[PDB]
Amino acid sequence: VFNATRFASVYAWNRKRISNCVADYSVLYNSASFSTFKCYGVSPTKLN
């Protein structure tokens, strides 16, 4: 989803489900490629 060649529109957004895996969020929050990272109901570092 992050490195996807194509995204959808807001008219119909792509809800890609994830399950049965290890979610290593370290390469997403610590990566210097996102101009915004806003964790509302959770801490961004506690996710790992």
Partner: protein, 49 residues
């Protein structure tokens, strides 16, 4: 009128977007690596291009 004992005026430069990390209790590339403030911070911040 109100006054205090001491003050520690800091001095540095950052990008315009990175000023949002200059606040009590932030997180990012500055507050976790370069320059961090306390959650109970008291003072005034000023900047100019």
């Amino acid at each position: 009128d109100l006054c205090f004992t001491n003050v520690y005026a800091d001095s540095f430069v950052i990008r315009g977007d990175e000023v949002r990390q200059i606040a009590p209790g932030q997180t990012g590339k500055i507050a976790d690596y370069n320059y961090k403030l306390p959650d109970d911070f008291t003072g005034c911040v000023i900047a100019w291009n």
